[model samples]
Target: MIIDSKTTLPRHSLIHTIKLNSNKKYGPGDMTNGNQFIISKQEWATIGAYIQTGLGLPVNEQQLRTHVNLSQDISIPSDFSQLYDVYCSDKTSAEWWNKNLYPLIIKSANDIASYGFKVAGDPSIKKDGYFKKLQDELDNIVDNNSDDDAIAKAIKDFKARCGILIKEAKQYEEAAKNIVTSLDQFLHGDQKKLEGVINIQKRLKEVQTALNQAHGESSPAHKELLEKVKNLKTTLERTIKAEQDLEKKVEYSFLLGPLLGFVVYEILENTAVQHIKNQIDEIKKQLDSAQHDLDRDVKIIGMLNSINTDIDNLYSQGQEAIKVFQKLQGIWATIGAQIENLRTTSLQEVQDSDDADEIQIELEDASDAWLVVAQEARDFTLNAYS
Candidate 1:
């Protein structure tokens, strides 16, 4: 599909049409329209992306080789929209793992070892003046085995006490990312596009507080450590709400908003970040608790299973679309066409919705459509697992 640049149509339309062809091999429209799904040269590109990410990509080869070594604490739903559901919330639980969590394990094995050393050496490890000194001693042990040893035996015991809190933290992180991304995506074409470029430098203070506390609790400490832990809880709650407020205040009328839209945003924003965070936290908790809660940890193994095939393929194809083959123009064309279709369809559909009942019905159907599509995509999860 080609568009005449000189035509009255917006330049964005033409660009998207080009991109669609370059990037996507199939789409939801394709499933229904067959080959005759002759989208405008503009809308094709956007729709194609929607399809590629939605349908199963090839497979992840790199992940296959590395899967055995990493923590399998979480698994993403095969469907893409699961990413969305994860992001739109204030908290998470094991249910959140279905949304967030991936393998980016830090070597906490080392920390665990050091903690064990202290646990064996000094009963005064928790004493006030000596506690910081011991904490320093623990922090001073720099070997890779330290964190693992610290909680190698205590992870399960600690989690049984704080598991719910950890789950909530993961959920909080996911929600935070969703709000942050949605706000940025609305302002810019992509959330990443604005990472350092935007004025969100101060926002990290909010994020860092939650991160610091959650991580700080990794080591075995006294029951009085509850105060510090509570602070972490408070920070996480604040961060989540602050981020959501940022997202909500953003008017989606910005140029990028129409390009992406609340529908696509709603579908993907939560799933991507929420799922990743939930899964990561789940893995960390399981790793921490493995020694004591061996049974529960073992059960979590199924959830943490990696999709080596999917990751590898996505990397290759994502590289091809963006950097390797340099077919970005073709990809953009397709996106343009889809954007036009969405805009036309949506603007016309709600232009005169004086009837609240009609609007409500439309909303219910739209939500159902989202759910139905998500279910259909779930079957492809194995393809993504390593």
Candidate 2:
């Protein structure tokens, strides 16, 4: 009912005609149901993003703490490509959790606090600096009739700390989001390089067709150009596959609710990005050799000039790769540092607290129970990336 719904020719879409869905009981009396929304090809394709509002969206802080997806939402991907067969159209164009980072990090840290509560509640079982605070919250909860109420207070405080980290992360988010948009331009989008991936295919095909027109299929130059395009196709396809693999890995890594997980994710992500970057280099050589051959024969066959333009277009797509990833290297590391803070500041610190194991064991269960409601209410309902 909020502008759009889940099913339609285009789900969650809007049209320009603003019909007041009012009735006799509401604002202006109904204009009847006469202005029922319709799906027209022109209206649908041209539908603007004005329908969604980032300013209007609110991230309800207190209510968000109520949710806890830790134990339950951890299902593994059945297919790899949802991480590609699906994937970023904008910098804002990442996973549901990217936008929902505040919620998961908010709770996951509280999740660490989960075990901390177990430990401090642990005196019956486990202090050092963190233990006193851990056990302090533990004792408050254990001593209280309403245990969750006490944990709510703690979670509230933890969330405040979480926001502080997210605010710091805001700086990195600014840059990381841009790099992501750049990479998304290369990866996901209206055209997937990786739009030049889409464009190159179309461009090269024209080069081939134009090549055929200029030089008969039986001609040696025609066959030679065809051979080079085949190589470009092969190399581009290889490069594309690696590009896609990174798409899955980098995005899939976000669901990790623990720091250790992100650690490995970073290692592999950098490694994977490295491999893809290298492949782009090799693909360029493929383009270069083709162009080198084209240089000598150009005057003899003037028609070859057309594909020269097409090949140049393809080459321009790759020129940006090196610098893009170079920017990515620094940006992701700093941004990832902030991501780790989101994990450790809350989860890891509480991990060291007292009365600990069973206390955390007890509270982990309690907090987890409260987590589900909060996550559902403040999270998915308001922030349905789906």
Candidate 3:
């Protein structure tokens, strides 16, 4: 309620002994006072609204004085918010004022008044101290009420979204491992099979050569060799078949392990639940911190958004690097295998041609470069002092 100078309440924490004026005369009269109800902003506003609707002079103060039938000499409090329970006529007005305005005043007063009292209503105090306290509480209500619930649900949904990727990653891991195992089996069999097949072919050729010579296109020595060749042919055919099977198995087996391992790792990367959890935990922490800071009016919500963006950028960069590295590793391995195949095929051709000059050149070069590189220097002798 509004008060003229005579009815002003003492703006102090505790009531004290009243100073009595001896003169009862109206001009320059002595004043004495005591506190009554402490009215709140909500009560004043309600009273103002009521008076505006009724007898409209000086609005709330006139209405309150007239209604209560109190003289100007009486003390009125700044916190008499409960007056609505006694004086408010309309249900809607009473409900609206009590529920909405009353709480605002309480929270504001509980926090802001203490702040204001500390700085004694100085301009700097109002702006820097009291306002900060009021704003902080407001920010707390804004951040922690519906927004916090929404953010929490969003986090849970995000984790679920990540789970789908995790499942797919697990599937990829299984597939990669299966392929790898098959590859290993193949590689292991290849060398043995190749050797067996080559030996069999050698024996078969020897047998046929002897048979030709035995027909007089050959000689006595050929006839002798022919007898040995017959035994070799039978033995070679069985061995060759076994070798062929082993070669196929070994080739595939040799490649399986690396291929599967690479694929498994790729899936692991995609499904990296631990990494996701870490990111989620980090994000949640930042969210909590942002909410706290907002509650304290220390920072803004926009800063939280920036933190999330930074996290996303870092993850994207890491994923890109992983993709490029894996791609290069596969390329290098394939190229190496092809180069080895070409080298082996060329060596076989040289062997088959039986070119002495080519063979000598390759042997001399290989021995000098490859073997010499492996040797330690032995030219210098250690001399001991006599």
- Top TM-score prediction, candidate number: 2
TM of each candidate vs. truth: 0.16, 0.25, 0.17
Give model 1's clash tally: 81
Put down candidate 3 lDDT per residue, 1-386, tens digits, no spaces: 22223433443212222112112111001111223112122122323222222111112444554532334554444332222322232223223333433333233223222321321223343443222232232333234354766644543443343344334333333433333332232222235322221232233234334323333123343333323333332232222222110101010111111001011111122333234334434433443443232211111112112222222322332233233323323322332343243234533453355333443343233222211111100000011000
lDDT leader: 2
After the best TM-score superposition of candidate 2, give how far the Cα of residue 374 lies from its true spot, in angstroms. Answer: 26
Where does model 3 exceed 4 Å of error? 1-303, 352-386
Summarize candidate 2's per-residue lDDT along 158-255 as a digit string, tens digits. Answer: 44544543444344335434544443453234352233233433534454455445442435654565454444433432322221111121212212
* Local error of candidate 2 at residue 19 (angstroms): 46
Worst-scoring 10-residue span by lDDT in model 2:
23-32
In order, what lDDT does every prediction score? 0.27, 0.31, 0.27
